Amino acid sequence: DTLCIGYHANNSTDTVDTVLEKNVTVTHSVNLLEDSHNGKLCRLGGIAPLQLGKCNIAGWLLGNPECDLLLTVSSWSYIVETSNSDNGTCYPGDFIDYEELREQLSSVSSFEKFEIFPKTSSWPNHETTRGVTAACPYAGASSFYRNLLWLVKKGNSYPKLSKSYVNNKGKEVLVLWGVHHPPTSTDQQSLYQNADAYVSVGSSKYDRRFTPEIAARPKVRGQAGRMNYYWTLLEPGDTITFEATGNLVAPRYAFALNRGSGSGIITSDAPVHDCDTKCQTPHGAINSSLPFQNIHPVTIGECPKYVKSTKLRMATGLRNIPAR
């Protein structure tokens, strides 16, 4: 009689490498590298993502005439910009510390929009109905940002204005505004009467003064003039004061911000779908318990560690030697 001692074998085709040998076929193994995604922008925590579509953060917050769709949105799980998010500042100019504002928004999960300075009632001594421009059209006609109010002189007179707002929202209030720079002194006097105007803005931590800089710049969107955009985060309980003798593109709407840890802004052209996920990438969502993924480095939620690897298979069984 005879008794032999041997080891298992099967029809496995799995292969793994080692320092000494490569392509070693084994009997059992586990893949640790996730490479599948549903190619769709899903919602995290049950909340939908904010699709900016053809608009970007600038156009959205300032209220570019082409971003009216976003107007009703007040909460999101993450912000999405497409490769066509070109609608931002329609009136040429510099948006000061724009990248920082974007970084700020990355931790905001929602806000409460409110009319910080009501258009009808805040500016008794100034024109509030002529602040439109062909540079920011809407339905062919001249228009302007929905969240800013371009004020001009009233009856050939622009009195020193002074308006303040006390932040009683119990949270950070994002206030935006602009300072206009006409191309010529004739335009300056024609819009604000005063030749030597200035705009002042102050809070407990913010304090800056702006002077008009008249000069004809190469026309951008048919404008030789420029308009700079500013913002600040007024702290709970603080006060912000605007003083000007011209050139002020006053705040109309502001946002009380709700901080939400974990979130961000991404660029994707993938479609938003009636889907749910715990891990989202610009290419699509991931539903995996694997330690690694090689789909995308940018992630949102609970995701596998990203890595460049093409294969991450770990042998669990023994070398397979069926020998049939």
Binding site: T2, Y7, T18, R102, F292, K305, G317
Partner: protein, 160 residues
């Protein structure tokens, strides 16, 4: 093979064995067949299961990680930011692959070792009552019947 058993003195594996990783064949008068050794197979399953679990543990989940924008006069910090992103990406890609590559080596050697120890165990268990043929087989003398083959398997046997 590092322990000379698998792909060594016990060439090929048994596709017939389908209830474990390490087992015996047995060819008695009453009949033949296959039988895997729990003690071994199970013990290995645990270890290997603890190994994979250990690996997953060490690797950290990746939470929200989004990019940053920079204007045309922040090229130096933009590059710093990129140098940092690529730096950690390479380091972790290196760590993942290298660990797997090394654990795979250790895993096979582990099995090879398990077989070898199973042999050596049966070997000293029998000794005189059978001779070493090779390919991991022992040819008895006192015609080991079924109940006898089992005695060897369950470790009892214990026959002078």
């Amino acid at each position: 093979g590092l322990f000379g058993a698998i792909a060594g003195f016990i060439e090929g594996g048994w596709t017939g064995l389908i209830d474990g990783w390490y087992g015996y064949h047995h060819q008695n008068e009453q009949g033949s067949g296959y039988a895997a050794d729990q003690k071994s197979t199970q013990n290995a399953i645990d270890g290997i299961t603890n190994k994979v679990n250990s690996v997953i543990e060490k690797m950290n989940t990746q939470f929200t990680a989004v990019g940053k924008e920079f204007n045309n006069l922040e090229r130096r910090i933009k590059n710093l930011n990129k140098k940092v992103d690529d730096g950690f990406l390479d380091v972790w890609t290196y760590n993942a692959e290298l660990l797997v590559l090394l654990e795979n080596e250790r895993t096979l050697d582990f099995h090879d070792s398990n077989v070898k120890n199973l042999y050596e165990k049966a070997r000293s268990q029998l000794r005189n009552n059978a001779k070493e043929i090779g390919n991991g087989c022992f040819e008895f003398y006192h015609k080991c019947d079924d109940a006898c083959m089992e005695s060897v398997r369950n470790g009892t046997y214990d026959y002078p």
